[PDB]
Design a binder for this molecule. Structure first.
Ligand SMILES: Cc1ncc(COP(=O)(O)O)c(CNC2CONC2=O)c1O
Ligand SMILES: Cc1ncc(COP(=O)(O)O)c(CNC2CONC2=O)c1O
Lengths: 382, 380
């Protein structure tokens, strides 16, 4: 595959192998790893991360909605997929044919699905319990038993799992974590029998309490080498290896004289004789406007973004006359200097999760494995 | 195509047609309209919008970089396409074979392209002049002459046009605008012969000063029905129709009791007996975390997003117990109420331009033309 703009993101798949393998070492050999690759593997490339994770020790995959699971099947993944979120009952059939397990949290959904499906393939369900997150999930004993019955009655419906999700697993103070864990324990007793897969843990829960995970963990953010929160970094068992880096190249260089304005709304004004560089990356690439007072790396050095950010390009003050074609690093290392997703996140006033996800389809992903390029994936490619 | 999650964007091509045909009316017969369709047509759909604009009166298209243009060509667009940004000298042969015009602003670029490309297709260049924007463009006299000379001298290189871009055309205060306009008029004299296409205007200068736009207007944001700035709204010649809306549906509804927490970090506490709904849209869909205190529309009413926004889901405080499947409009109209892109931008502390652009590949676009559903585009 190929690309024709000098702006690309690199994803280091060796880092992803290490982060997942270290977890397979840490967890009890009877506890499986469900790798979660929702949102195009948190902006990193769904099938590439999925293949790598399954190599390091993962056995299942998790996604947010049905289209994401089907897209993984089209690209040849044959591992089990759990759709963590909601789906349409009319689609139960397609999920069953493609061997995608579904999350269920309401009986009216199952009432509606028994009526539209009658084999031959089984649909594996994972009942979702709301123990304190307030998002999806059952919250009552009458409703938990109803779902279980409706599932028991249809011959093709199977309860493969049961889970919950924590709202504050990434907080140093485990008070709400404890209420939720204890609540899941009391909620599990409302089921006639324990299904084979009981899971609760995300990355913050499984890296902190490996012994409290039951038999399957749903490992997300830590797979990509990003800490669940800057509150648990010291509490982490093994070092995490960041996989994502973003880069560009200078396409225009010029010296300004004192008094000349730069970019929209002509915000910036040069005060001495300065060299301004232009890079082909802007807000439609996910390098949002709020980053206008941030900096990028050019030739091992920090250089500020100057003026407002444009849709496809932005300007930066250079140390002096640098050549056109000089690599600029937006996220990554250049020498002794480094800009991490947490740094971008801080400036954007968000969590690290939101950063790779916003780097758009427009920006190509180059995959590295065994310190060499494995494939290029340009979404608007030929 | 089709999609399997109840979150979708709707693009109204009729709005997009009217915004273009009205400028086609307001501009001279001589003057072309170049529809700017970069960034997947500002998040509205590249082919769908390109096609609609050409039907409405546009004769040319513009894109940001080479991959966006090759993508239009692969989808059947055979109308002219200018790449407004930069490209590699080594890709001038590809641009040529696919009939894509390129922006030029540096002499060393040409020198390099001249070594690498010998023919047989011609390559049409548009000389960019920097008159005050500081982004791309030639600034000095002898750099202009050197470009003209390197173009004149090569058998397959043609200078089809030249242009500039205004930094403050959306600004009420036209003082930097008139400095740029004057600088341009002056730089045009460093050229022996004035080329066939001279263009300077973005949407704002083309709707504000249609006569002082020469023979080609680049038309962007306003095509999508969005004003260039809040300051320019009551100075525009016709009403713009808004093309983009975003919808979702309730997938869970629950009554929460007081002292009960909602979402990450448990930062929302239920104070009364509240009905809470979950919708399948979140920050990976471009509905950013910062929209946490914002109002969406459910059943004709504003309803707040309560608790933190998740990757793929978020929660809202419902007026009462509504059925699962109820349509929630995040951008758009629900009876009596409207949320515009300008509203979303206000809360995210940005400009409208940024909004449809971040609504991600994950969100299908349903297109309407002639008041009927034309097409569904689902990226994954
Ligand atoms: C049910 C479920 N389990 C596991 C994960 C992944 O856990 P980590 O990526 O923290 O290791 C997610 C991601 N859900 C997200 C991610 O961000 N916001 C959300 O609601 C999820 O929804
Ligand atoms: C050269 C050029 N012409 C026309 C347009 C579109 O004009 P409007 O969208 O204002 O009607 C742009 C968008 N350039 C942008 C947009 O945002 N940041 C940029 O650098 C452009 O770069």
């Amino acid at each position: 595959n190929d690309f024709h703009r000098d702006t690309w993101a690199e994803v280091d798949l060796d880092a992803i192998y290490d982060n997942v393998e270290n977890l397979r070492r840490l967890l009890p050999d009877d506890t499986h790893i469900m790798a979660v690759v929702k949102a195009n593997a948190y902006g990193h490339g769904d099938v590439q991360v999925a293949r790598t994770a399954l190599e390091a020790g993962a056995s299942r995959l998790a996604v947010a909605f049905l289209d994401e699971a089907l897209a993984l099947r089209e690209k040849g993944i044959e591992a089990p997929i759990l759709v963590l979120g909601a789906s349409r009952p009319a689609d139960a059939a397609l999920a069953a044919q493609q061997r995608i397990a579904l999350t269920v949290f309401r009986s009216d959904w199952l009432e509606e699905a028994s009526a539209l499906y009658s084999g031959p393939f089984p649909i594996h369900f994972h009942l979702k319990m709301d123990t304190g997150m307030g998002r999806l999930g059952v919250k009552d004993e009458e409703e938990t038993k109803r779902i279980v019955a409706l599932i028991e009655r249809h011959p093709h419906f199977v309860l493969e799992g049961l889970y919950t999700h924590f709202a504050t697993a990434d907080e140093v103070n485990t008070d709400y974590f404890s209420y939720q864990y204890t609540r899941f324990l009391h909620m599990l007793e409302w089921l006639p029998s324990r299904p084979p897969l009981v899971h609760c843990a995300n990355s913050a829960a499984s890296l902190r309490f490996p012994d409290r995970t039951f038999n399957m963990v749903r490992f997300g953010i830590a797979m990509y080498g990003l800490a669940p929160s800057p509150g648990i970094k010291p509490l982490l068992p093994y070092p995490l290896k960041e996989a994502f880096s973003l880069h560009s190249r200078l396409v225009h260089v010029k010296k300004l004289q004192p008094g000349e304005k730069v970019s929209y709304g002509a915000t910036y004004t040069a005060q001495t004789e300065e060299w301004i560089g232009t890079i082909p990356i802007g807000y439609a690439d996910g390098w949002l406007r709020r980053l206008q007072h941030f900096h990028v790396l050019v030739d091992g050095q920090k250089a500020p973004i100057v003026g407002r950010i444009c849709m496809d390009q932005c300007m930066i003050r250079l140390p002096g006359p640098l050549p056109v074609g000089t690599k600029v690093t937006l996220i990554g290392r250049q020498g002794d200097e480094v800009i991490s997703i947490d740094d971008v996140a801080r400036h954007l006033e968000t969590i690290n999760y939101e950063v790779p996800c916003t780097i758009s389809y427009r920006v190509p992903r180059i995959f590295f494995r065994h310190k060499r390029i494995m494939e290029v994936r340009n979404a608007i490619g030929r």
